Amino acid sequence: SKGEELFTGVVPILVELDGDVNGHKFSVSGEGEGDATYGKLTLKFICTTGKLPVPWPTLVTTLVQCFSRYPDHMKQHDFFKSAMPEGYIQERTIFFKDDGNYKTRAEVKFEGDTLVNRIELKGIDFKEDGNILGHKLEYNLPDGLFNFVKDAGEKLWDADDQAKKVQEHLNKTGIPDADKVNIQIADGKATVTGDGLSQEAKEKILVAVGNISGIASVDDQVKTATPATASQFYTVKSGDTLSAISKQVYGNANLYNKIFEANKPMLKSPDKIYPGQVLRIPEELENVYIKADKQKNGIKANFKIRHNIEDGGVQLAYHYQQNTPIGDGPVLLPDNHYLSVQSKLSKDPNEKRDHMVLLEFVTAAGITLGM
Ligand SMILES: [K+]
């Protein structure tokens, strides 16, 4: 198990992708670094040929799982590092439901002190007005400033006494940790400041202040003691039901109670949603499932990605993966396990080329009972 030595600290990363999707050719270069002790990746990608013809999110999985955090009890199962520095070949087919597919072949290996991921991608059969080539997928979840339908929500005053009325509302309705934030109201703009809340507790506070009549935006100045993926925020439409919303955002109405619970105690029952109300849509988690493929000396994985569609819905991307070592030295062939991935996409306001900034955390784990 030599290869783990190479990952004990911060390691620079080069990524190069040459892609052609339905004859639309493009290239991507990536620079940054990974820290496998923390399963952490910090990378920025640039479309070097111009504008990217597909949504950036659809390329994330293709654009170095040797940087996954494998805890001590899991190191027996870390195929990815055991193949270093000679590396591995990583191949996938990605089936976008009701649309085209990507086929990818990548070489992942050290070149000097740098871990390099060189990729060839070919996409075919996509609908030129589909969600992919039509650029209908949301890039990321809005940060920092959240917008609400200004005149929707609880009526706390007619048209610091305003911020006082808000704080009393948060308290009276039972919003957890309302006593750990400070509210400021400036002409339809609320600023919420606080420290050491959960991601979930923060989100419930933000939504409860925004769902007040006369509040058009909420400035999230709240630090979470600990990150974690944010939820989607959904604006209720005339005619909506929680069941129909669930069908759109998750794919089935049978997850409607997931939305209801995630918006308690602000929301008292499924029938009390109203047009213009913002609701938290908690992530439906997807894991990466890995298995060994010994008579090929590597591993297989399967998983799916949920890509949010901008104007409502989810585009599923089914992934099937095979990894084969490049070197002939023995490698670790793991037991069945899974990886848990948290990813955040952002933009450099000063960058002018088509790009993607990526922050990612990945951890390994053993298959659970509920699985
Ligand atoms: K409002």
Residue numbers in the entry: 3 to 65, 69 to 164, 172 to 383
Sentences from the paper on this structure:
We have previously reported a prototype intensiometric K+ biosensor, designated GINKO1, based on the insertion of K+-binding protein (Kbp) into enhanced green fluorescent protein (EGFP). Genetically-encoded fluorescent K+ biosensors are promising tools to further improve our understanding of K+-dependent processes under normal and pathological conditions. The potassium ion (K+) is one of the most abundant cations across biological systems. Here, we report the crystal structure of a previously reported genetically-encoded fluorescent K+ biosensor, GINKO1, in the K+-bound state.
To better understand the K+-dependent fluorescence response mechanism of GINKO1 and facilitate further engineering, we determined the crystallographic structure of GINKO1 in the K+-bound state at 1.85 Å. Well-diffracting crystals of the unbound state were unattainable. The K+-bound crystal structure revealed the location and coordination geometry of the K+-binding site of Kbp, which was not apparent from the previously reported NMR structure. Notably, the K+ ion is coordinated via 6 backbone carbonyl oxygen atoms (from amino acids V154, K155, A157, G222, I224, and I227). The distances of coordinating carbonyl oxygens to K+ in GINKO1 range from 2.6 to 3.2 Å with a mean value of 2.8 Å, similar to those in KscA (2.70 to 3.08 Å, with a mean value of 2.85 Å), and valinomycin (2.74 to 2.85 Å). One difference is that K+ is coordinated via 8 oxygens from backbone carbonyls in both KcsA and TrkH, and 6 backbone carbonyls in Kbp. The structure further revealed that the K+ binding site is located in the BON domain, close to the interface between the BON and LysM domains. This is consistent with the previous finding that the BON domain binds K+ and the LysM domain stabilizes the K+-bound BON domain. We suspect that fusing Kbp to EGFP constrains the conformational mobility of Kbp, thus increasing the stability of Kbp protein for it to be crystallized as a domain in GINKO1. K356R, a mutation that doubled the fluorescence change ΔF/F0, is located at the interface of the Kbp and EGFP in the GINKO1 structure.
